Every structure is written in structure tokens, then in C-alpha cells.
Amino acid sequence: GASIFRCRQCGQTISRRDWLLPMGGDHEHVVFNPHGYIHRVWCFSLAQGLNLIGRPSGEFSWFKGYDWTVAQCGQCGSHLGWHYEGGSQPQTFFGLIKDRLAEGPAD
Numbered sequence: 001g002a003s004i005f006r007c008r009q010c011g012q013t014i015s016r017r018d019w020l021l022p023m024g025g026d027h028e029h030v031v032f033n034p035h036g037y038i039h040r041v042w043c044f045s046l047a048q049g050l051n052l053i054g055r056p057s058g059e060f061s062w063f064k065g066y067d068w069t070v071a072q073c074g075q076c077g078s079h080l081g082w083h084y085e086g087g088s089q090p091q092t093f094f095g096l097i098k099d100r101l102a103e104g105p106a107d
Ligand SMILES: O=C1CC[C@H](NC(=O)c2ccccc2C(=O)O)C(=O)N1
Pocket: 032, 033, 034, 035, 037, 059, 060, 061, 062, 063, 068, 082
């Protein structure tokens, strides 16, 4: 039972442990926004249940080569992280904020 990652606010299924993706040799990145707020971000190859908000941006990306878009939970609107695109190996992935996910057993 790969564990399941749900939205912490509502419980919607978002991703799974077996979809964790090492970027830079690690699937966990401790990063901060340009205001100096820390986020602990886990990278996933795939995710479901998310809505993308806005257009992609290249500014301030944590991951070289990728442009990003805000990702919210499609059920409750919680800001769960970001979708990345435009790169290679992989072309796209998700960076999700660990503390906004709740990891647990399958249904
Ligand atoms: O790779 C990326 C994804 C997006 C991310 N930006 C933010 O985290 C951001 C920017 C301005 C204000 C707040 C935030 C935030 O979501 O915490 C950033 O700095 N890098």
C-alpha cells in the first residue's frame, strides 16, 4: 500500500507515494518564496484532483528549466503547491507543499 496523499483541508485524494519523484537527487526540497517564507515541497510525477490557477511563470522557479503555475485542490481550493512544465526529464511534475497534504492508507 503505497500511501496516499490527500488534501489536508478536505481529504481529496491528490497523489501517492509511488509517484514521488527525485528532482536533483531528492524528492524533498526545503525552499522559500521571495518573501522568505519556507515551504517543504515534495515532488510528484503525477497528481490528480488539482486545478491550475493563472498562467505559467518563469520567474523564481525553484527548478531549473521549468515554468510554474499555482495548483489548488479542485474540491476545496486549498493551495497545495505548483505544477511545473517546460523542462526535460521530466517534461512536467508537481511540487506540493507537504504540510498541506495528509499522508495515509488507501481508501
Ligand atoms: O518555484 C516556485 C513556485 C512558486 C513560488 N512562489 C511562492 O511560493 C510565492 C510567491 C509569492 C508569494 C507567495 C508565495 C507562496 O506560495 O508562498 C516560488 O517562489 N518558486
